[model samples]
Target chain A: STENLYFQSNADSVQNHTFEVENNTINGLELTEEQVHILYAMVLQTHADVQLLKEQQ
Target chain B: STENLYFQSNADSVQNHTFEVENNTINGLELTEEQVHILYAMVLQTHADVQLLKEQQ
Candidate 1:
């Protein structure tokens, strides 16, 4: 099967959101804890930037 | 410095976009090609979903 990951961004409040990465596996290899941590941090930072961009509009 | 990844969504045209991940490293460890590939796939997938959501709005 072709690999395709998924993402979900759920906002609980204007200031709170939960971002998820689903179906994140490559050749049956799951990311290590540290790797996952890095990925999350990356996404979180990007999301924050997007929020700031929206706020400016 | 603390680890923070950045994202850039550059749209070259209505249907062409370039998604980038910057500063993607963990503890001085760079991802293997396979890992980077996986990460890119994840981000690209997420970006597509976000675009779809925007189109719906």
Candidate 2:
């Protein structure tokens, strides 16, 4: 639960969100756990949103 | 171009691409290679767009 990574949406965008990775600050090294987690979450949310939209339409 | 799945963008939408899966209609059976390939392409495009956006910003 602690040391988690998250994001804040852009002020006026439905598809603009920002997230940061820990201990992986553009060093070009292996991606950190936070980076992997956020990427996973991003994929999940991206696909889920599309599926929901298709369902509603 | 034999036995390959394909698509065309919606004329008035930036985010709509329709694909057809063989023998895997609403019955919800296992997905075919064409279906998997379309989803794989979709994910690639989604992430590539985000990375490009972050780079440009």
Candidate 3:
């Protein structure tokens, strides 16, 4: 089964932002309207995926 | 148990963007400080979540 993954950052300017997924197993999935809205909030956080993942970890 | 999902964009302009979810079922889940931060990065990716999934497929 595919698992969902959620990530967030610790930057003050980037608070109130959140990301969520319903599929992560390379199954090729699409996002819902709500997911897109949430993704838009993430654009303002950071540009580094590795950095964000590290911080989330 | 609930499953977690993670998604990433493939467009060059949106490659740096990625979204994740810890819970995807209609659980009304909330994100942590870290999850919010990661979301900010996903905003800049392609707006067409559908296109991304098609590519992944």
Candidate 4:
């Protein structure tokens, strides 16, 4: 079965410009939208290599 | 268990500015980098509610 994904629509303190990108969720954890995406990109890039896997052995 | 996600580092035709970003992959499909994220965001936004679920039997 596909891992069911879900999210709740809620904003951080709107007065602090935190709602800039319309979200605060990622990886089942909450974070600034930009930060979440940055981490996501990093995850994609980091896992994109086979050489990087167990390279020390 | 957490769902395992994977991505490959690749670029589109350098002539089409497809290589402009880092890569073009998401949800097991290859797409322009920016388009990948836009669709991802749309998915998150659309699923961020219970009201959107069926309200009638």
- In Å, residue A30's CA in model 2 sits off its true spot by 30
User: What digit string (tens of lDDT, one per residue) describes model 2 on residues A1-57?
Assistant: 333322233322323311122122333223333444655677897767666555655
Ranking by lDDT: 1, 2, 3, 4
- Model 2 Cα lDDT, one tens digit per residue, B1-57: 433323322331332221122112312322333454565577778977655554555
Residue B6's lDDT in candidate 4: 21
**Candidate 1: segments with Cα more than 4 A from true spot:** A1-37, A44-57, B1-31
Label model 2 with its docking quality class: incorrect
lDDT of 3 by residue, B11-53 (tens): 3323333322333333223333335455544543433443554
The TM-scores of all predictions, comma-separated, are 0.29, 0.26, 0.16, 0.20
In model 3, where do residues sit more than 4 Å from their true spots? Answer: A1-31, A47-57, B1-57
Candidate number with greatest DockQ: 3
Residue A21 in candidate 3, Cα distance off native in Å? 23
Top candidate when judged by TM-score against the true structure: 1
**For model 1, how many clashes?**
0
Ranking by DockQ: 3, 1, 2, 4
Pairs with backbone N, CA or C atoms under 3 Å apart (clashes), candidate 1: none
DockQ of 4: 0.02
Higher-ranked by lDDT: 1 or 3:
1
True contacts preserved, each candidate? Answer: 0.04, 0.04, 0.25, 0.00
